């Protein structure tokens, strides 16, 4: 066969160890899921530093904890604007997922609270910024560089999927690179805890699996398709399906045809044909061996999965080095108290 006895026993034991870790992982998650933490800081504990972002539901601000001097990225959400945009369940669910998950490649919620007007999510601050900007700047990542990021995503999805969480918004825009060069997944606004199938049309056009486009029910296998899009974009510099309007992107997505740059290795193309697989009965991540089809693929043969999880692998790139930010009113009356009881 492909493996003699020693390699087969080693792989078997590693896979058994993953099950054991995931089982304890679920247990820790479910406790926090069933009893979420609330109100663990207040606004005047922080100095406003800089508005890093602004959006439909609120703003992101770099803040500095007055006591400890630590910096954080504080998502401020206008409760009334959340209500008017019909985003109550998404907001509640995002915070509830973030306070329950624990994984070295997932951005951590350090505090959360609310006041009369707003909801606040105080996150770990990642000054390196988004993968998107590094990728567009450098152009494309070499395959060993792309692979180091991909391995972290594979592990994170293996973790989330074991919790029955589908992530649904993978893209370089949502992947931050921390000061050791490792990935922080951000923005759980479209994540859903569901065991079976779900139907919501959501995600980013370039990254949508065909069965989302085709109005089928779908499951966690859409995240493995999105992994294929991500690996392709990291290694090519552009995504596998693009056009100037979304509708023409969807036509390419469902067509079952993808083309590769001539510098893609054959191992990479094989992996991507198995991830970017329209037929759900053939898509890696979705078969009887689950995620092991991906972890065991030839393109990941040099990947030490434990060393990656333990963050012992030297990153291929370290963003240039606290608080570097280069590369709000509170009503006397409480608004929307009932809607946000759980926050």
């Amino acid at each position: 066969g492909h493996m003699g006895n020693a390699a087969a026993a080693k792989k078997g034991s590693e896979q058994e160890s993953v099950k054991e870790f995931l089982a304890k992982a679920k247990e820790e998650f479910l406790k926090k899921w069933e009893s979420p933490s609330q109100n663990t800081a207040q606004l005047d504990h922080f100095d406003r530093i800089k508005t890093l972002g602004t959006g439909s539901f609120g703003r992101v601000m770099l803040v500095k904890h007055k006591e400890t001097g630590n910096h954080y990225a504080m998502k401020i959400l206008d409760k009334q604007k959340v209500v008017k945009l019909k985003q109550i369940e998404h907001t509640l669910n995002e915070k509830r997922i973030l306070q329950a998950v624990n994984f070295p490649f997932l951005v951590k919620l350090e505090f959360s609270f609310k006041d009369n007007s707003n909801l606040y999510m105080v996150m770990e601050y990642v000054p390196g910024g988004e993968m998107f900007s590094h990728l567009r700047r450098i152009g494309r990542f070499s395959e060993p560089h792309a692979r180091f990021y991909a391995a972290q995503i594979v592990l994170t999805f293996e973790y989330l999927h074991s919790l029955d969480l589908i992530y649904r918004d993978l893209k370089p825009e949502n992947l931050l690179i921390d000061q050791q060069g490792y990935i922080q997944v951000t923005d759980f606004g479209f994540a859903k805890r569901v065991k079976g199938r779900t139907w919501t049309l959501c995600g980013t056009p370039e990254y949508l699996a065909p069965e989302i486009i085709l109005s089928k029910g779908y499951n966690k296998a859409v995240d493995w398709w999105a992994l294929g899009v991500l690996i392709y974009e990291m290694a090519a510099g552009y995504p596998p399906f693009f056009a100037d309007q979304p509708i023409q992107i969807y036509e390419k997505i469902v067509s079952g045809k993808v083309r590769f740059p001539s510098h893609f290795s054959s191992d990479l193309k094989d992996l991507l044909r198995n991830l970017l697989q329209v037929d759900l009965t053939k898509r890696f991540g979705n078969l009887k061996n689950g995620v092991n089809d991906i972890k065991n693929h030839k393109w990941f043969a040099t990947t030490d999965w434990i060393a990656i999880y333990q963050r012992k692998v030297e990153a291929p790139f370290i963003p240039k080095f606290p608080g570097d930010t280069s590369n709000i009113r509170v009503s006397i009356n409480e608004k929307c108290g009932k809607e946000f009881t759980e926050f």
Binding site: D169, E173, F190, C202, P205, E206, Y238, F242, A243, D244
Partner: peptide, 18 residues
């Protein structure tokens, strides 16, 4: 070329969810 097509797509910037 594919890269030139990508540039011409107008979708080289940060992409919004639908």
């Amino acid at each position: 070329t594919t890269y030139a097509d990508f540039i011409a797509s107008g979708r080289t910037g940060r992409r919004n969810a639908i």
